[PDB]
Design an enzyme around this catalytic site. Structure first.
Site, PDB file in Angstrom:
ATOM      1  N   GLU A  71      -7.604   7.844   9.564  1.00 41.10           N
ATOM      2  CA  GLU A  71      -6.741   7.856   8.942  1.00 41.10           C
ATOM      3  C   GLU A  71      -7.298   6.838   7.759  1.00 41.10           C
ATOM      4  O   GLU A  71      -7.099   7.168   6.466  1.00 41.10           O
ATOM      5  CB  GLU A  71      -5.481   7.096   9.470  1.00 41.10           C
ATOM      6  CG  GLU A  71      -4.463   6.983   8.721  1.00 41.10           C
ATOM      7  CD  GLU A  71      -3.266   5.974   9.153  1.00 41.10           C
ATOM      8  OE1 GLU A  71      -3.353   4.739   9.672  1.00 41.10           O
ATOM      9  OE2 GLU A  71      -2.182   6.422   8.768  1.00 41.10           O
TER      10      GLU A  71
ATOM     11  N   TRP B 122       0.307  11.910  11.008  1.00 43.32           N
ATOM     12  CA  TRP B 122       1.064  12.195  10.030  1.00 43.32           C
ATOM     13  C   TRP B 122       1.731  13.345   9.840  1.00 43.32           C
ATOM     14  O   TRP B 122       2.323  13.734   8.686  1.00 43.32           O
ATOM     15  CB  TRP B 122       0.411  12.002   8.507  1.00 43.32           C
ATOM     16  CG  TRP B 122       0.234  10.675   8.391  1.00 43.32           C
ATOM     17  CD1 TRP B 122      -1.025   9.851   8.602  1.00 43.32           C
ATOM     18  CD2 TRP B 122       0.847   9.564   7.999  1.00 43.32           C
ATOM     19  NE1 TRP B 122      -0.967   8.691   8.177  1.00 43.32           N
ATOM     20  CE2 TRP B 122       0.235   8.467   7.931  1.00 43.32           C
ATOM     21  CE3 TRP B 122       2.310   9.650   7.738  1.00 43.32           C
ATOM     22  CZ2 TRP B 122       1.053   7.204   7.495  1.00 43.32           C
ATOM     23  CZ3 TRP B 122       3.110   8.710   7.170  1.00 43.32           C
ATOM     24  CH2 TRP B 122       2.321   7.279   6.998  1.00 43.32           C
TER      25      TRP B 122
ATOM     26  N   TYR C 164      -0.361   6.197   0.157  1.00 44.62           N
ATOM     27  CA  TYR C 164      -1.604   5.215   0.380  1.00 44.62           C
ATOM     28  C   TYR C 164      -2.661   5.483  -0.418  1.00 44.62           C
ATOM     29  O   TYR C 164      -3.191   4.501  -1.061  1.00 44.62           O
ATOM     30  CB  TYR C 164      -1.782   5.057   1.606  1.00 44.62           C
ATOM     31  CG  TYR C 164      -0.625   3.999   2.725  1.00 44.62           C
ATOM     32  CD1 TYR C 164       0.018   3.028   2.689  1.00 44.62           C
ATOM     33  CD2 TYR C 164      -0.090   5.130   3.567  1.00 44.62           C
ATOM     34  CE1 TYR C 164       1.104   2.754   3.722  1.00 44.62           C
ATOM     35  CE2 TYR C 164       0.968   4.960   4.590  1.00 44.62           C
ATOM     36  CZ  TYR C 164       1.573   3.479   4.388  1.00 44.62           C
ATOM     37  OH  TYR C 164       2.413   3.753   5.631  1.00 44.62           O
TER      38      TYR C 164
ATOM     39  N   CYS D  70       4.939   1.105   4.587  1.00 43.09           N
ATOM     40  CA  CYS D  70       4.954   0.143   5.708  1.00 43.09           C
ATOM     41  C   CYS D  70       3.988  -0.879   5.334  1.00 43.09           C
ATOM     42  O   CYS D  70       4.493  -2.198   4.867  1.00 43.09           O
ATOM     43  CB  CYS D  70       4.909   0.783   6.779  1.00 43.09           C
ATOM     44  SG  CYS D  70       5.883   2.107   7.453  1.00 43.09           S
TER      45      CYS D  70
ATOM     46  N   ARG E  39       6.264  -4.610   5.059  1.00 37.33           N
ATOM     47  CA  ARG E  39       7.539  -4.651   4.928  1.00 37.33           C
ATOM     48  C   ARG E  39       8.412  -4.136   6.135  1.00 37.33           C
ATOM     49  O   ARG E  39       9.650  -4.746   6.311  1.00 37.33           O
ATOM     50  CB  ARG E  39       8.081  -4.099   3.486  1.00 37.33           C
ATOM     51  CG  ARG E  39       7.785  -2.600   3.078  1.00 37.33           C
ATOM     52  CD  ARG E  39       8.604  -1.798   3.353  1.00 37.33           C
ATOM     53  NE  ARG E  39       8.621  -0.314   3.491  1.00 37.33           N
ATOM     54  CZ  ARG E  39       9.407   0.397   4.507  1.00 37.33           C
ATOM     55  NH1 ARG E  39      10.204   0.419   4.766  1.00 37.33           N
ATOM     56  NH2 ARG E  39       8.764   1.668   4.737  1.00 37.33           N
TER      57      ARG E  39
ATOM     58  N   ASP F 221       7.075  -1.294  13.235  1.00 45.75           N
ATOM     59  CA  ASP F 221       7.646  -0.669  14.557  1.00 45.75           C
ATOM     60  C   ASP F 221       6.810  -1.417  15.430  1.00 45.75           C
ATOM     61  O   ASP F 221       5.579  -1.235  15.483  1.00 45.75           O
ATOM     62  CB  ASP F 221       7.453   1.088  14.638  1.00 45.75           C
ATOM     63  CG  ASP F 221       7.566   1.338  15.749  1.00 45.75           C
ATOM     64  OD1 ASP F 221       7.617   1.054  16.688  1.00 45.75           O
ATOM     65  OD2 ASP F 221       7.570   2.597  15.893  1.00 45.75           O
TER      66      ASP F 221
HETATM   67  C1  LIG Z   1       1.249   2.691  11.850  1.00 54.50           C
HETATM   68  C2  LIG Z   1       0.870   3.897  11.636  1.00 54.50           C
HETATM   69  C3  LIG Z   1      -0.111   5.186  11.539  1.00 54.50           C
HETATM   70  N1  LIG Z   1       0.931   6.337  11.914  1.00 54.50           N
HETATM   71  C4  LIG Z   1       2.089   6.466  10.878  1.00 54.50           C
HETATM   72  C5  LIG Z   1       3.525   6.090  11.554  1.00 54.50           C
HETATM   73  C6  LIG Z   1       4.321   6.697  10.401  1.00 54.50           C
HETATM   74  C7  LIG Z   1       5.571   6.718  10.374  1.00 54.50           C
HETATM   75  C8  LIG Z   1       6.370   5.890  11.593  1.00 54.50           C
HETATM   76  N2  LIG Z   1       7.493   5.885  12.069  1.00 54.50           N
HETATM   77  C9  LIG Z   1       7.794   5.116  12.942  1.00 54.50           C
HETATM   78  N3  LIG Z   1       9.091   5.260  13.430  1.00 54.50           N
HETATM   79  N4  LIG Z   1       7.031   4.458  13.750  1.00 54.50           N
HETATM   80  C10 LIG Z   1       5.702   4.271  13.405  1.00 54.50           C
HETATM   81  O1  LIG Z   1       5.084   3.585  14.005  1.00 54.50           O
HETATM   82  C11 LIG Z   1       5.155   5.168  12.405  1.00 54.50           C
HETATM   83  C12 LIG Z   1       3.857   5.167  12.168  1.00 54.50           C
HETATM   84  C13 LIG Z   1       1.030   6.673  13.265  1.00 54.50           C
HETATM   85  C14 LIG Z   1       1.983   7.487  13.596  1.00 54.50           C
HETATM   86  C15 LIG Z   1       1.992   7.976  15.121  1.00 54.50           C
HETATM   87  C16 LIG Z   1       1.515   6.972  15.907  1.00 54.50           C
HETATM   88  C17 LIG Z   1       1.621   7.531  17.590  1.00 54.50           C
HETATM   89  O2  LIG Z   1       2.461   8.241  17.726  1.00 54.50           O
HETATM   90  N5  LIG Z   1       0.865   7.045  18.656  1.00 54.50           N
HETATM   91  C18 LIG Z   1       0.728   7.203  19.914  1.00 54.50           C
HETATM   92  C19 LIG Z   1      -0.231   8.571  20.617  1.00 54.50           C
HETATM   93  C20 LIG Z   1      -0.935   8.927  19.291  1.00 54.50           C
HETATM   94  C21 LIG Z   1      -2.164   9.622  20.022  1.00 54.50           C
HETATM   95  O3  LIG Z   1      -2.366  10.623  20.503  1.00 54.50           O
HETATM   96  O4  LIG Z   1      -3.553   8.956  19.272  1.00 54.50           O
HETATM   97  C22 LIG Z   1       0.132   5.865  20.838  1.00 54.50           C
HETATM   98  O5  LIG Z   1       0.927   5.134  21.576  1.00 54.50           O
HETATM   99  O6  LIG Z   1      -0.639   5.555  19.921  1.00 54.50           O
HETATM  100  C23 LIG Z   1       0.634   5.847  15.853  1.00 54.50           C
HETATM  101  C24 LIG Z   1       0.772   5.733  14.390  1.00 54.50           C
HETATM  102  C1  LIG Z   2       5.462   2.896   9.243  1.00 57.78           C
HETATM  103  C2  LIG Z   2       4.181   3.105   9.145  1.00 57.78           C
HETATM  104  C3  LIG Z   2       2.945   2.240   9.436  1.00 57.78           C
HETATM  105  O1  LIG Z   2       2.064   2.555   9.030  1.00 57.78           O
HETATM  106  N1  LIG Z   2       3.632   1.300  10.083  1.00 57.78           N
HETATM  107  C4  LIG Z   2       4.947   1.583  10.921  1.00 57.78           C
HETATM  108  O2  LIG Z   2       5.114   0.432  11.539  1.00 57.78           O
HETATM  109  N2  LIG Z   2       5.788   2.325  10.349  1.00 57.78           N
HETATM  110  C5  LIG Z   2       6.869   2.369  10.690  1.00 57.78           C
HETATM  111  C6  LIG Z   2       8.109   1.273  10.452  1.00 57.78           C
HETATM  112  C7  LIG Z   2       9.637   1.970  10.552  1.00 57.78           C
HETATM  113  O3  LIG Z   2      10.099   1.827  12.002  1.00 57.78           O
HETATM  114  C8  LIG Z   2       9.153   3.228   9.973  1.00 57.78           C
HETATM  115  C9  LIG Z   2       9.310   3.307   8.781  1.00 57.78           C
HETATM  116  O4  LIG Z   2      10.496   3.442   8.412  1.00 57.78           O
HETATM  117  P1  LIG Z   2      11.290   2.776   7.158  1.00 57.78           P
HETATM  118  O5  LIG Z   2      10.579   3.352   5.968  1.00 57.78           O
HETATM  119  O6  LIG Z   2      10.688   1.239   7.418  1.00 57.78           O
HETATM  120  O7  LIG Z   2      12.801   3.232   7.280  1.00 57.78           O
HETATM  121  O8  LIG Z   2       7.839   3.605  10.466  1.00 57.78           O
END
Ligand SMILES: C#CCN(Cc1ccc2[nH]c(N)nc(=O)c2c1)c1ccc(C(=O)N[C@@H](CCC(=O)O)C(=O)O)cc1
Ligand SMILES: *c1cc(=O)[nH]c(=O)n1[C@H]1C[C@H](O)[C@@H](COP(=O)(O)O)O1
Ligand SMILES: C#CCN(Cc1ccc2[nH]c(N)nc(=O)c2c1)c1ccc(C(=O)N[C@@H](CCC(=O)O)C(=O)O)cc1
Ligand SMILES: *c1cc(=O)[nH]c(=O)n1[C@H]1C[C@H](O)[C@@H](COP(=O)(O)O)O1
Lengths: 264, 264
Positions: free
Chosen positions: B58, B80, B94, B146, B166, B169
């Site tokens: 990433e 993603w 980003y 985020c 901002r 999670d």
């Molecule tokens: C932040 C960020 C980047 N991203 C972007 C991202 C985009 C939207 C978001 N949406 C929400 N509701 N929460 C997030 O944290 C979130 C994160 C991520 C997306 C998914 C996972 C995740 O599901 N992870 C698992 C298993 C993933 C694996 O197979 O490696 C784990 O517990 O790590 C991690 C990061």
């Molecule tokens: C965004 C992606 C990232 O890299 N970090 C994360 O923590 N998320 C999260 C926060 C939130 O739960 C959600 C984005 O939702 P919103 O745009 O804040 O409504 O994914």
């Protein structure tokens, strides 16, 4: 105030001597966070006398989208003269970014009324943000935004706000920057029929200039007085309609004012 | 990790019940700050096994200035997927903003090249920032940034970085972003021949999703272990040239697993 005074001691205790563009030299630390419950009182410093006249006028001016100092002059406010050009311009600083951030495809976004629509229709978004940090216009600004980015939050019918300050003159600037955001929060909260919550200040390069250590130890030798109270005598039809006289500060009894030179 | 576990409890202790955009519900706090001394060990959480290939791709994806999940799928990173369109596009997220901020007059600003130049030529600058919060193209993004804005700082031959998040999670996003940003710091330190400093994290809406209550409880009951060591096998000729294979971590023996659903 308690918080500001402990921050001032932290910079002295943990600061590192750095060189800066103004050529003055600072003692600085990196990253700090403080919180003010606006329910405890209006956060105007008491250990030195502050002037609300200028805090209020600079804030009305940014809400106006104005970036020329004449307004400031019409009102006897000279805080910005050192940076204006021959015409009184500062370039596309705070007021411009707030009210008309230029997009690539020829639009302008009014960040202030957008935050107001969110507060009203989805006080719960996690995106209630106003940014002065326009990368594309930084080059046209007399000074880069110090108070760069801010976010609003609503939880128990209370409005809070966290500011990210990238650069902080702890002695001259901070007291002014806090008083200003606190006034804003009160302004918005009154527009939205909400109660005021907390003001969170977060800092980047948080420093004390070299030509300010004496004023710093003098201030520090003082005990904060009870916080002043803010009173608004009207509810204007919009945040853009406030008047200097709609505001009254009650119970402000500060210690004597301390003079310090501003850096370049 | 300790600061990490400690925020998990703060959220449970003081969080406010919120109705989320995802319609999932959350426990939230507004304004949090944590600091990691990079000299003390790589901040990868040990209370759960973290998978680094996805953290690595990433970030290389971001520095390449990419918004297409193509590159990621070729590396098996599925992160993603729920946000990209049918061409695998996210909009000017980003990577786009880091590398090609679009001015209002046609041009592009390369914020990572501006930063490397600053670290090299003006390390004392209070303006070493990278902003992904382009107000002008929010509308066009699959999801708003985020991890929104960051600043670098050089103090005693060491390189620090502060991120403003901002929306966070706590369970799922937090650990990821923390490792990501600890990773860039080391990359910039090497490319700038600086010492690693502190990674300061500040968030706004810091929350726990209602369906992460079991996983959290599980997590809170495990003992933090010693932080791994990050090793960079070679010294690319530019920050634009690192690669999966360039980074090794030693000393990581995390606790088993935890699987939790992502909020849509
Ligand atoms: C932040 C960020 C980047 N991203 C972007 C991202 C985009 C939207 C978001 N949406 C929400 N509701 N929460 C997030 O944290 C979130 C994160 C991520 C997306 C998914 C996972 C995740 O599901 N992870 C698992 C298993 C993933 C694996 O197979 O490696 C784990 O517990 O790590 C991690 C990061
Ligand atoms: C965004 C992606 C990232 O890299 N970090 C994360 O923590 N998320 C999260 C926060 C939130 O739960 C959600 C984005 O939702 P919103 O745009 O804040 O409504 O994914
Ligand atoms: C921040 C901000 C807005 N502004 C803008 C502004 C612009 C550039 C800056 N440059 C520097 N080096 N420090 C700053 O605080 C600073 C502030 C201000 C400008 C001057 C004063 C000042 O001279 N003030 C008082 C002393 C009382 C004080 O220090 O409050 C005076 O009347 O002398 C205050 C605020
Ligand atoms: C900027 C203006 C204000 O609102 N508050 C601030 O504290 N200042 C300060 C910080 C610093 O001393 C200076 C700006 O300089 P630089 O852009 O960091 O080089 O004014």
């Amino acid at each position: 105030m308690k918080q500001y005074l402990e921050l001032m001691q932290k910079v002295l205790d943990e600061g590192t001597q750095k060189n800066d563009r103004t050529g003055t030299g600072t003692l600085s630390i990196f990253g700090h966070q403080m919180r003010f419950n606006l329910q405890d009182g209006f956060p105007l410093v008491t250990t030195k006398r502050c002037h609300l006249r200028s805090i209020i006028h600079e804030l009305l001016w940014f809400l106006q989208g104005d970036t020329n100092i004449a307004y400031l002059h019409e009102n006897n406010v000279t805080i910005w003269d050192e940076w204006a050009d021959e015409n009184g311009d500062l370039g596309p600083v705070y007021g411009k970014q707030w009210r008309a951030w230029p997009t690539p495809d020829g639009r302008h976004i009014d960040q202030i009324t957008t935050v107001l629509n969110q507060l009203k229709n989805d006080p719960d978004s996690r995106r209630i943000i106003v940014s002065a940090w326009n990368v594309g216009e930084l080059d046209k600004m007399a000074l880069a935004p110090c108070h760069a980015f801010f976010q609003f939050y609503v939880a128990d019918g209370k409005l809070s706000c966290q500011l990210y300050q990238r650069s902080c003159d702890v002695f001259l600037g901070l007291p002014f920057n806090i008083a200003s955001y606190a006034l804003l929060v009160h302004m918005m909260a009154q527009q939205c029929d909400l109660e005021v919550g907390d003001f969170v200040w977060t800092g980047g390069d948080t420093h004390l200039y070299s030509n300010h250590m004496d004023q710093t130890h003098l201030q520090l030798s003082r005990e904060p007085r009870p916080l002043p109270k803010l009173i608004i005598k009207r509810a204007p039809e919009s945040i853009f309609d406030y008047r200097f006289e709609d505001f009254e500060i009650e119970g402000y009894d500060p210690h004597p004012g301390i003079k310090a030179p501003v850096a370049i």
